[PDB]
């Protein structure tokens with residue numbers, strides 16, 4: 001495990017969200033990883049629980065893009081990106097910062113997504 | 125405490141680094157805050173230890189700028205920014221992502237700065 005590997009994991013994650021490739025997203029994660037995403041709310045913990053969370057993330061097709069270089073050090077990575085979707089004619093762009101901690105095996109053991117209302121950008 | 129307060133704290137932090145205003149930086153932090161900055165290395169814990177760390181950060185004058193909107197939710201904030209300095213004729217720009225957790229009193233209880241070698245940008 002290396003910054004190069006962690007950076008590549010972030011890019012595979014972003015591409016798999018764009019693709020709607022749940023096997024691909026879930027495969028990045030350790031068997032006992034947790035995911036906490038949408039506040040400082042309740043973390044989901046199984047392989048099964050993580051898949052189900054992304055299943056739901058992906059109802060609408062997402063356009064996902066890294067908007068700066070990945071920061072990768074030690075066993076963690078942080079990244080700024082946008083998630084864009086369209087619903088009943090309105091485009092929304094969400095701009096989180098996610099954080100990944102890695103396993104010694106190179107797997108994501110935890111992901112936390114930070115964004116608040118000011119990071120949801122949408123017209124009427 | 126609110127996303128608006130946390131966001132303002134990030135901006136006061138950035139301005140105080142630019143100013144070289146150690147009282148101003150240190151005042152953002154709880155009496156028992158920790159700061160971990162430069163890897164996944166050893167966290168500094170006192171008021172005194174935090175001041176001493178910033179004293180050292182600030183030998184060279186720093187030009188500091190937020191490069192995207194702050195993400196503020198729950199009791200945490202994350203932000204992407206750059207720290208620029210000049211030494212023996214060479215300009216370096218460092219591009220971290222920092223993370224702050226807040227106290228119920230609105231004080232920073234912890235700061236973690238994530239950046240690796242790929243986030244240090246410098247010519248010869």
Ligand SMILES: C[C@]12CCC(=O)C=C1CC[C@@H]1[C@@H]2CC[C@]2(C)C(=O)CC[C@@H]12
Nearest residue numbers: 017037057058062083094096098113115
């Ligand atoms: C989960 C997600 C993508 C995966 C990721 O890693 C970070 C985010 C944050 C924005 C989410 C988005 C999924 C779709 C969501 C739930 C909406 O309908 C509004 C907020 C938005």
Ligand SMILES: C[C@]12CCC(=O)C=C1CC[C@@H]1[C@@H]2CC[C@]2(C)C(=O)CC[C@@H]12
Nearest residue numbers: 141161181182186207218220222237239
């Ligand atoms: C500590 C710092 C500013 C405070 C902050 O919040 C984040 C950083 C990361 C880059 C540091 C910089 C201080 C000066 C440093 C130590 C150098 O001489 C090369 C790396 C650079």
